[PDB]
Amino acid sequence: GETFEFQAEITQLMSLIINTVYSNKEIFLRELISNASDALDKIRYQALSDPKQLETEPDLFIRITPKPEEKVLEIRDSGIGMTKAELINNLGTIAKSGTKAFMEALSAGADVSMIGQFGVGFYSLFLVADRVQVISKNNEDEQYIWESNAGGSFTVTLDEVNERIGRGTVLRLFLKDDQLEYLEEKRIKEVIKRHSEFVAYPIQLLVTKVQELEELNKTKPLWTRNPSDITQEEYNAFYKSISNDWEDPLYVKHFSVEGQLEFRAILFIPKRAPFNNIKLYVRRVFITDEAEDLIPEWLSFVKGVVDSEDLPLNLSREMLQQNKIMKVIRKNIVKKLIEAFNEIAEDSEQFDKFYSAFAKNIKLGVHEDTQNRAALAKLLRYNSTKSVDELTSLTDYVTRMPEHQKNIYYITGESLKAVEKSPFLDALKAKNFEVLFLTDPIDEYAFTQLKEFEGKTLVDITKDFELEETDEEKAEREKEIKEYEPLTKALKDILGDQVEKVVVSYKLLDAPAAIRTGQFGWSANMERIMKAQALRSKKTFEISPKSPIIKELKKRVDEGGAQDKTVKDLTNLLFETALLTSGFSLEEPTSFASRINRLISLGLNID
Amino acid sequence: GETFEFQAEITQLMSLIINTVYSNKEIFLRELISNASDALDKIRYQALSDPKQLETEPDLFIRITPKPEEKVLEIRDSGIGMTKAELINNLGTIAKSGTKAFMEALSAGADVSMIGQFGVGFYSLFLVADRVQVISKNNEDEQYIWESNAGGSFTVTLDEVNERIGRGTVLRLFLKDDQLEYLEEKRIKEVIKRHSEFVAYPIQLLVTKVQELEELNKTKPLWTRNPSDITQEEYNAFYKSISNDWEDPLYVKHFSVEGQLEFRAILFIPKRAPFNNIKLYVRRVFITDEAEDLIPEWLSFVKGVVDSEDLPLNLSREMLQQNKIMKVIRKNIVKKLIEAFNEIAEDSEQFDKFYSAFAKNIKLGVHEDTQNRAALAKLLRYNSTKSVDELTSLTDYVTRMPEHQKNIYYITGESLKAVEKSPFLDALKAKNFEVLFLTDPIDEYAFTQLKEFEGKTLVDITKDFELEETDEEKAEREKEIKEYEPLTKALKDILGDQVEKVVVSYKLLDAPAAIRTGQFGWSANMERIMKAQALRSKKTFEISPKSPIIKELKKRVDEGGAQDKTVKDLTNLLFETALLTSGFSLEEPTSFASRINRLISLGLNID
Amino acid sequence: PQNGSGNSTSIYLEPTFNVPSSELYETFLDKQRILAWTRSAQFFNSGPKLETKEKFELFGGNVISELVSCEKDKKLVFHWKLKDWSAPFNSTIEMTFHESQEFHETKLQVKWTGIPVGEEDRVRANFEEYYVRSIKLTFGFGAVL
Amino acid sequence: MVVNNPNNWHWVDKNCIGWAKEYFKQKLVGVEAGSVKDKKYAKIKSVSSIEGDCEVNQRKGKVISLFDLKITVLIEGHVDSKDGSALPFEGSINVPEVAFDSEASSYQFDISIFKETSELSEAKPLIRSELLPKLRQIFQQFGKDLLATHGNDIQVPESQVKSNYTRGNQKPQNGSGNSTSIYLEPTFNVPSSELYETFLDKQRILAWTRSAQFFNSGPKLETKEKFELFGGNVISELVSCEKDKKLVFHWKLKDWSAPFNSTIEMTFHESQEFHETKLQVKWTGIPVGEEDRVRANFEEYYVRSIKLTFGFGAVL
Ligand SMILES: Nc1ncnc2c1ncn2[C@@H]1O[C@H](COP(=O)(O)OP(=O)(O)OP(O)(O)=S)[C@@H](O)[C@H]1O
Ligand SMILES: Nc1ncnc2c1ncn2[C@@H]1O[C@H](COP(=O)(O)OP(=O)(O)O)[C@@H](O)[C@H]1O
Ligand SMILES: [K+]
Ligand SMILES: [K+]
Ligand SMILES: [Mg+2]
Ligand SMILES: [Mg+2]
């Protein structure tokens, strides 16, 4: 069998790299600026060994000059340049990367990180131009001209009519009729700010005011510097460049992981919630920001960028392929941010602004994330009966727990004033038990997933629960409940199916009646939350045997008033009154108002 | 000066086309099945002119035989096959598409819908296979073997050590050590059910139970058929194939646009909300399903697929270019779905299931979409005082409007029982004015964007509004308001900043007082909704001059009871009671419950 | 090789419900309660609750189930089969209850066997929609966000 | 242009939104209905705005155009008057969309006459008699001239195409840049009385901003008064303001240089019919590479921040 070799259809391969190789057409500017930075790195590496190479053009820059009169987009660089042979091999052969050939010929442990690795990045300019006139100039060769019309052939002619340049490469892009938008100041600065905003070399733009030169990349990258030498003002300016936010970042988490996944990442925590956000960079070039596995959903508020190096890029260099490595960077970002959140908790003023601004995000991780659920519970802060002034953590709660307490008691509601005056606190305050206050709707979603903190079970006092009691009170309560048995049976028949059961409870001191969930169903706040969401249980009647109102109702039952008209009216009135205190919503609030209006008439001597 | 030709680096182009083009490694199976379908279309096109070309293999099938012991994944097809020259020219040269050349040889207007157009889809198999042993057999040639390992060369040897085949091409894939996952039954069926599900030819898979052959593509495409010839059972099985749902589709919308843009779409409306969904197909091959400019977010509940045979595809053939064709398909899909929604509205039993299941989605379009806001407003169905049984539309509302009514009155709240007994309906029922009932939280978001329906202004009766009465009534009402001026000033000083102003309103008949907003801000229901969201206004005290309680309070003011203790208690009692009827959240309900307990004690002769 | 069907597989899920095992056990048997979280149920016998060897269609008749074995609030074994499935394929789903008195929760260990190879991911995603989240939103046996 | 498409097989796109605007500016103007000597007359004077998409594409040799433009023009003329000579009037014509497959009866025309009155009842039948049929034939001819002018710019001639399939389908020193200006109209559900004091009362400003540093001890903002917002990064100065009608501020970001200083012009358009207010913001002086940054943040720190702190409108 004959052994042939693989060929290439130049007339058709060029069309694949000119027509459908780049979803967007603004990519041509990024891949040309990136090619200019690579040439600047080559001449800079040679300047360390031969200063005469950087003597012709010592100023390293990248100049862009738009010309709307003749529709020419000029991009001039002062790099190493290309000889006559390089224009034929490096700039005339598909998939031939002279930059990658230069990287493999370096020494061990190099400090230069070039971008050109594929070799088809130069053909991007044909998306917006019909013909390109490349003017190159090398130190060991003359100045030549590389002309092509995106077809199958190109012409290399010695430069004898254009302006003489010292060293570098000049690209004259004759833009098409429909692609004239790249001759304006807006579209030029838009692509650079989006793609090539973090180029190490200054990018100069010739803007017509009289014409001037403006540096587009004003904020130098900080991920290539040590986090100890960077001041606070540099982090503020860097945050205002990666994101359009006007305010300064609240906290900056700059770390560096080494080994087999060497990557830089500067994560910023803003002062206000932005309600993606983490950009990805490879070789000082913005790739994309649509990575959904890089940052969790509950942690999507953190700003910043991630500059990695070992990432498999496609032919367009604007998306990442599946490699099972993004999960490794995912857990490292969460590990550093949780460590960063603990450092914020060390200070009082910093954590006060962080918790008040991202209370929903921290509590959402307890509901969603499971591996670091215990670490996020350390950051939870809530008010309580002993912390009405400031906020306290769950660890400080257990520290103040007495020896005879075995559960973390809390209560949920709509606002702080509703749960602070709730009648469910009178039982725990008598036993010197601290009760946390839940005011946010997401609070219950977090407590229903944690279920335990340092061995202490989270128990909601709104639901049915049991406390400790002495032997003298245990026998006294059983006797009194048996005596109030006909009273509970009378209230059950009046309400009917409105309550599950009527029992005598001793966890009430001032309120004559209250309603509890049943420790298995949705609470009064949770039921109210679900019935009020735009994008989207049984009741227990407990009365207090020590209240004077309940004692008067008990006397009526023994006198044959189980079916009296006045008793049934006060029964429905006391039941619906307890629903307002327990956090339930009254059905048909007009009937409840009619009962109050008749009481006011009774007090005003109205017959 | 010197004119050269564009060359290609074969040793580097092979690595770029294979490794840095496709995002996933399972894409290799999609192109090999697509190339098998193309070869079957070539021999089928020749069978119509020469039946002798289909006598060596009359069965047009695609067989896949995995071998875990030998680590070989064989993909056999019965297509036209490749000769000795085709294995070197078409298969040996990169970017050379013989299938595209076959499409260019025939005349314009044929019935061929072949897939292969680029010419670099065959090399995708090297992402999972170390070396390939593709075996081909043509009618006008012998049987040859095409061996290659992506090493810059291939071998073409006459086949003498394999089983003789009639016609087609056998693809022998020696999978790598790390890519052995494609030898099981789960992974093979997963890729076929994702990329090559709607292949016109049967895809056979050799599964080991004894080994049998199972047809993977059991559901033939329905877009290649007229919508009149398709029955209802075929649409149900087709819906269960495009999606993983178990229930039958509630409504089917099959349309086809023929003209400058030729694309077909079969859109299914499910019976339950799935809380993307519309997949795009080119040449009957799955391209992508994450299109954002294809279907709106509020309309994304609709299931189905869209056949878009002619579209600008990417080199990986899994993404669309920036060509402005998505917007043209976007407006056509919404137009057909709105037309489909009108056809559902023509029925009575079917529209009840559609509206009850997608009430939020229809109202989200009125809030978000503006160009089609009037078309979606006619689909809104709510309850009213005259339509307590079934839901009524906005068109039927205007029909029942009297001649002296100029505004559409509605009311929002928590539930239907709360809005039907609200004290705001007594004024409109006296004037024979129908008032709509809003029970969903998204209802207010839709009415705050429409603002007009057929010239009728949407007016919420909860907010402060003015009714039209005779001039004789305005004279007697001004005297009664002037007489009750010190009464309103007394209630204002007691409440303080709790209300904006206290005025005498005549829109209340039975209720003593109520609370309304200041016509700007969040309503009573809207304020409760915003304060209850997990992922996330001044009051007017209007009293009724005909209520007996208000008249008794007026007598107390004339007797110097503006600072009386009993008057201030009943003043805060009527205010906090009106908040419960108007839909406002009560602050510190413990203080309100203490007032009720003192009234119950007063009624029970408790000193 | 002849024309036939593929093999079968098995899955395992543990959806956590906030409901006692006594009430959750009656949810899968009480026909009045089944119609609530399913929205479409067709029973062939006049019995009030489900019994052994009793077939019933769910979700418009596309889901055919049959109770073959069950214990008192401890075990629930059903024969699950979809309408589009072939005749030989017939899956068997087992439901084991684990009531926790400390956290007031019930982990329903679901051991489902007999699922076709291609129908593995389909019956798993829809189970969390028609069985897990449907009961949590209808009877309030769990917070869904 | 140079198109490297062998046999015209790949999708080559050519945007024509620029030529489309120049086409209607030479076809829509000068179109008159009636005559000057007649009692009723109408004529288009200029095009207000042309927004949408206008692009030509080719797949296999067929010149395909899927344009969709929303055209708005201004018209003049005069109508009959009872006393005296004819009375001139001004108006505007609004077209919802001009698609490629639109028929003669598919084109809609939203009549918008300025200073409506009972005497101008004959203004609508005037444009519907001669002016509308002239606009229909132009829109139908727009698709033909588009495929004939820019169609030859793509699909290289058949003399170089060896495909009979596709052939049968063919028919200075360092400095800085200049500035720019943006315009947006956020809608608020609040009368101009409370919305005006929102941007002036220092107690209310701190509510929707949560960060402010006022240098004067005044109760509310006055003319020629500086104040820093958002930790001192936003520097604004009130230089002119009218009673609930106009607000002029000198907006300036700390990141900007010295020769850059923007100016915000706010105009109140409260409408008591729907109980809302359209705050037309004419913002000028923003740098070229900064207009998208300040506009996206204005809808976050100024538009949504006020509607969520004070509740001046529901958002979702
Ligand atoms: N402006 C330039 N100045 C000097 N040499 C250049 C310039 N642009 C391109 N080259 C050379 O041309 C070669 C090919 O460049 P490209 O075709 O863009 O591919 P690449 O840059 O090597 O890799 P990619 O695809 O851009 S990641 C480079 O390796 C350089 O040697
Ligand atoms: N299974 C097959 N049987 C016959 N011919 C094939 C088969 N697979 C590929 N070919 C031929 O080999 C050539 C290389 O195909 P490919 O690189 O996949 O191009 P495309 O992706 O455009 O089909 C094609 O022109 C096609 O005609
Ligand atoms: K090259
Ligand atoms: K090929
Ligand atoms: Mg490049
Ligand atoms: Mg292929």
Tab-separated table of all heavy atoms in Angstrom, chain D residues 169-202:
chain	number	residue	atom	x	y	z
D	169	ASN	N	-28.769	29.898	-9.712
D	169	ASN	CA	-29.439	30.644	-8.657
D	169	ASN	C	-29.204	32.146	-8.746
D	169	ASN	O	-29.927	32.908	-8.096
D	169	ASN	CB	-28.984	30.140	-7.282
D	169	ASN	CG	-29.299	28.673	-7.065
D	169	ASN	OD1	-30.398	28.320	-6.636
D	169	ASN	ND2	-28.333	27.811	-7.357
D	170	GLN	N	-28.220	32.586	-9.524
D	170	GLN	CA	-27.938	34.006	-9.661
D	170	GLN	C	-28.861	34.640	-10.695
D	170	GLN	O	-29.252	34.011	-11.681
D	170	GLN	CB	-26.478	34.230	-10.055
D	170	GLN	CG	-25.474	33.608	-9.098
D	170	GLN	CD	-24.039	33.937	-9.461
D	170	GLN	OE1	-23.109	33.233	-9.065
D	170	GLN	NE2	-23.852	35.014	-10.215
D	171	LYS	N	-29.205	35.900	-10.457
D	171	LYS	CA	-30.091	36.635	-11.353
D	171	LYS	C	-29.310	37.636	-12.198
D	171	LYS	O	-28.201	38.034	-11.844
D	171	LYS	CB	-31.182	37.354	-10.557
D	171	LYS	CG	-32.045	36.429	-9.713
D	171	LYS	CD	-33.087	37.208	-8.930
D	171	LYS	CE	-33.941	36.284	-8.077
D	171	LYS	NZ	-34.964	37.033	-7.298
D	172	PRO	N	2.254	64.144	15.460
D	172	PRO	CA	1.341	64.440	16.569
D	172	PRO	C	1.947	64.115	17.930
D	172	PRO	O	2.754	63.192	18.042
D	172	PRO	CB	0.138	63.539	16.279
D	172	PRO	CG	0.707	62.401	15.507
D	172	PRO	CD	1.799	62.992	14.662
D	173	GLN	N	1.558	64.870	18.951
D	173	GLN	CA	2.051	64.675	20.306
D	173	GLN	C	1.023	63.921	21.143
D	173	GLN	O	-0.103	63.658	20.713
D	173	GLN	CB	2.389	66.021	20.955
D	173	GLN	CG	3.440	66.828	20.208
D	173	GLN	CD	4.812	66.179	20.239
D	173	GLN	OE1	5.605	66.333	19.310
D	173	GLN	NE2	5.101	65.455	21.315
D	174	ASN	N	1.430	63.570	22.361
D	174	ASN	CA	0.547	62.843	23.261
D	174	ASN	C	-0.541	63.762	23.803
D	174	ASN	O	-0.277	64.902	24.196
D	174	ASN	CB	1.347	62.237	24.414
D	174	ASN	CG	0.484	61.420	25.356
D	174	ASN	OD1	-0.048	61.940	26.337
D	174	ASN	ND2	0.341	60.133	25.062
D	175	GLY	N	-1.772	63.257	23.820
D	175	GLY	CA	-2.899	64.028	24.305
D	175	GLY	C	-4.080	63.171	24.709
D	175	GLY	O	-3.906	62.099	25.295
D	176	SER	N	-5.289	63.633	24.398
D	176	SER	CA	-6.508	62.908	24.726
D	176	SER	C	-7.494	63.048	23.573
D	176	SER	O	-7.262	63.783	22.611
D	176	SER	CB	-7.129	63.412	26.034
D	176	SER	OG	-8.277	62.657	26.376
D	177	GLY	N	-8.608	62.325	23.683
D	177	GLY	CA	-9.631	62.325	22.660
D	177	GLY	C	-10.673	63.408	22.874
D	177	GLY	O	-10.543	64.286	23.728
D	178	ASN	N	-11.728	63.332	22.068
D	178	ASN	CA	-12.828	64.282	22.136
D	178	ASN	C	-13.909	63.751	23.078
D	178	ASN	O	-13.708	62.777	23.808
D	178	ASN	CB	-13.377	64.555	20.737
D	178	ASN	CG	-12.358	65.217	19.831
D	178	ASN	OD1	-12.269	66.444	19.769
D	178	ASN	ND2	-11.583	64.407	19.120
D	179	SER	N	-15.071	64.392	23.069
D	179	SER	CA	-16.204	64.008	23.897
D	179	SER	C	-17.365	63.566	23.009
D	179	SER	O	-17.271	63.556	21.779
D	179	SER	CB	-16.624	65.160	24.814
D	179	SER	OG	-16.998	66.301	24.062
D	180	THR	N	-18.471	63.197	23.650
D	180	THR	CA	-19.673	62.770	22.946
D	180	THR	C	-20.884	63.160	23.787
D	180	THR	O	-20.771	63.916	24.755
D	180	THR	CB	-19.631	61.264	22.655
D	180	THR	OG1	-20.825	60.875	21.963
D	180	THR	CG2	-19.520	60.472	23.949
D	181	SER	N	-22.051	62.637	23.413
D	181	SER	CA	-23.285	62.945	24.119
D	181	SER	C	-24.254	61.782	23.965
D	181	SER	O	-24.291	61.117	22.926
D	181	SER	CB	-23.923	64.240	23.601
D	181	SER	OG	-24.227	64.142	22.220
D	182	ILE	N	-25.042	61.546	25.015
D	182	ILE	CA	-26.039	60.485	25.036
D	182	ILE	C	-27.387	61.092	25.406
D	182	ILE	O	-27.477	62.221	25.887
D	182	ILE	CB	-25.670	59.350	26.014
D	182	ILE	CG1	-25.471	59.905	27.426
D	182	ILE	CG2	-24.425	58.618	25.538
D	182	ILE	CD1	-25.097	58.855	28.449
D	183	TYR	N	-28.444	60.318	25.168
D	183	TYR	CA	-29.801	60.768	25.450
D	183	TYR	C	-30.651	59.572	25.851
D	183	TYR	O	-30.723	58.585	25.113
D	183	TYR	CB	-30.410	61.474	24.234
D	183	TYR	CG	-31.802	62.017	24.469
D	183	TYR	CD1	-31.995	63.230	25.115
D	183	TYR	CD2	-32.923	61.314	24.047
D	183	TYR	CE1	-33.265	63.730	25.333
D	183	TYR	CE2	-34.196	61.806	24.259
D	183	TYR	CZ	-34.361	63.014	24.903
D	183	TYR	OH	-35.628	63.507	25.117
D	184	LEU	N	-31.288	59.666	27.016
D	184	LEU	CA	-32.155	58.612	27.519
D	184	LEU	C	-33.365	59.240	28.192
D	184	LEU	O	-33.315	60.385	28.651
D	184	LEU	CB	-31.425	57.687	28.507
D	184	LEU	CG	-31.077	58.224	29.900
D	184	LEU	CD1	-30.799	57.071	30.850
D	184	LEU	CD2	-29.884	59.169	29.855
D	185	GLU	N	-34.458	58.480	28.246
D	185	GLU	CA	-35.722	58.937	28.823
D	185	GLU	C	-36.260	57.870	29.767
D	185	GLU	O	-37.128	57.071	29.391
D	185	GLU	CB	-36.742	59.263	27.732
D	185	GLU	CG	-36.347	60.420	26.830
D	185	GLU	CD	-37.401	60.727	25.784
D	185	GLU	OE1	-38.362	59.940	25.659
D	185	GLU	OE2	-37.269	61.756	25.089
D	186	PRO	N	-35.766	57.826	31.004
D	186	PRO	CA	-36.323	56.882	31.979
D	186	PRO	C	-37.686	57.343	32.471
D	186	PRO	O	-37.920	58.534	32.687
D	186	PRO	CB	-35.286	56.885	33.107
D	186	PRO	CG	-34.649	58.231	33.015
D	186	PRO	CD	-34.623	58.579	31.550
D	187	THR	N	-38.589	56.383	32.647
D	187	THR	CA	-39.956	56.657	33.069
D	187	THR	C	-40.086	56.427	34.569
D	187	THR	O	-39.646	55.395	35.085
D	187	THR	CB	-40.949	55.772	32.312
D	187	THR	OG1	-40.800	55.982	30.903
D	187	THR	CG2	-42.378	56.103	32.718
D	188	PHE	N	-40.690	57.390	35.262
D	188	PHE	CA	-40.894	57.316	36.702
D	188	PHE	C	-42.367	57.524	37.019
D	188	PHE	O	-43.041	58.337	36.379
D	188	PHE	CB	-40.052	58.364	37.442
D	188	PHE	CG	-38.573	58.215	37.230
D	188	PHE	CD1	-37.937	58.877	36.193
D	188	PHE	CD2	-37.817	57.415	38.071
D	188	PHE	CE1	-36.575	58.742	35.997
D	188	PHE	CE2	-36.455	57.275	37.880
D	188	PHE	CZ	-35.834	57.940	36.842
D	189	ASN	N	-42.862	56.784	38.009
D	189	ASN	CA	-44.245	56.922	38.463
D	189	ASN	C	-44.286	57.815	39.703
D	189	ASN	O	-44.475	57.368	40.835
D	189	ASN	CB	-44.855	55.550	38.732
D	189	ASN	CG	-44.925	54.689	37.487
D	189	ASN	OD1	-45.921	54.706	36.762
D	189	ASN	ND2	-43.867	53.930	37.230
D	190	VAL	N	-44.108	59.109	39.457
D	190	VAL	CA	-44.059	60.115	40.517
D	190	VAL	C	-44.238	61.491	39.886
D	190	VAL	O	-43.632	61.775	38.841
D	190	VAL	CB	-42.745	60.018	41.312
D	190	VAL	CG1	-41.545	60.000	40.373
D	190	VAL	CG2	-42.627	61.161	42.311
D	191	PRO	N	-45.067	62.364	40.457
D	191	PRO	CA	-45.213	63.713	39.901
D	191	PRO	C	-43.911	64.497	39.985
D	191	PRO	O	-43.010	64.183	40.765
D	191	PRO	CB	-46.305	64.346	40.775
D	191	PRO	CG	-46.308	63.534	42.031
D	191	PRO	CD	-45.962	62.141	41.606
D	192	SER	N	-43.825	65.539	39.155
D	192	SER	CA	-42.614	66.352	39.096
D	192	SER	C	-42.372	67.139	40.377
D	192	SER	O	-41.267	67.655	40.568
D	192	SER	CB	-42.680	67.310	37.905
D	192	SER	OG	-42.677	66.601	36.679
D	193	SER	N	-43.373	67.245	41.253
D	193	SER	CA	-43.176	67.954	42.514
D	193	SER	C	-42.233	67.184	43.432
D	193	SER	O	-41.285	67.754	43.983
D	193	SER	CB	-44.524	68.190	43.197
D	193	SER	OG	-44.360	68.894	44.416
D	194	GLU	N	-42.478	65.884	43.606
D	194	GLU	CA	-41.617	65.071	44.456
D	194	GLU	C	-40.336	64.653	43.745
D	194	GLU	O	-39.303	64.470	44.399
D	194	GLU	CB	-42.374	63.832	44.941
D	194	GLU	CG	-43.589	64.140	45.803
D	194	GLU	CD	-43.216	64.713	47.158
D	194	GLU	OE1	-42.064	64.512	47.598
D	194	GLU	OE2	-44.078	65.363	47.785
D	195	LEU	N	-40.381	64.495	42.420
D	195	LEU	CA	-39.187	64.089	41.685
D	195	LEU	C	-38.157	65.210	41.623
D	195	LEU	O	-36.952	64.939	41.566
D	195	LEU	CB	-39.568	63.634	40.276
D	195	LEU	CG	-38.453	63.022	39.423
D	195	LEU	CD1	-37.855	61.807	40.114
D	195	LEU	CD2	-38.975	62.655	38.043
D	196	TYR	N	-38.605	66.467	41.636
D	196	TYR	CA	-37.670	67.588	41.617
D	196	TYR	C	-36.906	67.686	42.930
D	196	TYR	O	-35.684	67.881	42.938
D	196	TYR	CB	-38.419	68.889	41.327
D	196	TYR	CG	-37.562	70.131	41.424
D	196	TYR	CD1	-36.711	70.492	40.388
D	196	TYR	CD2	-37.610	70.947	42.547
D	196	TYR	CE1	-35.928	71.627	40.471
D	196	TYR	CE2	-36.830	72.084	42.638
D	196	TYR	CZ	-35.991	72.419	41.597
D	196	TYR	OH	-35.212	73.549	41.683
D	197	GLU	N	-37.609	67.552	44.056
D	197	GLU	CA	-36.964	67.611	45.362
D	197	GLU	C	-36.108	66.385	45.652
D	197	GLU	O	-35.326	66.413	46.609
D	197	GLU	CB	-38.017	67.778	46.459
D	197	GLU	CG	-38.851	69.042	46.326
D	197	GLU	CD	-39.880	69.181	47.430
D	197	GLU	OE1	-39.956	68.279	48.292
D	197	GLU	OE2	-40.613	70.193	47.439
D	198	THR	N	-36.237	65.318	44.859
D	198	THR	CA	-35.409	64.136	45.072
D	198	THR	C	-33.945	64.424	44.760
D	198	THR	O	-33.048	63.938	45.459
D	198	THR	CB	-35.922	62.977	44.217
D	198	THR	OG1	-37.311	62.755	44.494
D	198	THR	CG2	-35.144	61.703	44.516
D	199	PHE	N	-33.684	65.216	43.723
D	199	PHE	CA	-32.327	65.551	43.317
D	199	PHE	C	-31.777	66.783	44.024
D	199	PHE	O	-30.640	67.179	43.747
D	199	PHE	CB	-32.266	65.767	41.801
D	199	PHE	CG	-32.639	64.554	40.998
D	199	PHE	CD1	-33.940	64.370	40.560
D	199	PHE	CD2	-31.687	63.601	40.675
D	199	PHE	CE1	-34.286	63.256	39.818
D	199	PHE	CE2	-32.027	62.484	39.935
D	199	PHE	CZ	-33.328	62.312	39.505
D	200	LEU	N	-32.544	67.398	44.919
D	200	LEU	CA	-32.106	68.600	45.618
D	200	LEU	C	-32.039	68.437	47.127
D	200	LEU	O	-31.079	68.901	47.748
D	200	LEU	CB	-33.031	69.783	45.282
D	200	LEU	CG	-32.719	70.593	44.020
D	200	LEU	CD1	-33.021	69.803	42.755
D	200	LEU	CD2	-33.482	71.909	44.030
D	201	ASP	N	-33.029	67.790	47.738
D	201	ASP	CA	-33.044	67.631	49.188
D	201	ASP	C	-31.926	66.689	49.617
D	201	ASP	O	-31.918	65.512	49.241
D	201	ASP	CB	-34.400	67.105	49.648
D	201	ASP	CG	-34.534	67.084	51.158
D	201	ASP	OD1	-34.627	68.172	51.763
D	201	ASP	OD2	-34.546	65.979	51.740
D	202	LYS	N	-30.984	67.209	50.409
D	202	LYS	CA	-29.829	66.413	50.816
D	202	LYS	C	-30.238	65.208	51.652
D	202	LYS	O	-29.563	64.172	51.617
D	202	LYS	CB	-28.839	67.284	51.589
D	202	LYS	CG	-28.294	68.458	50.791
D	202	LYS	CD	-27.304	69.271	51.607
D	202	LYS	CE	-26.736	70.424	50.796
D	202	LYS	NZ	-25.759	71.228	51.581
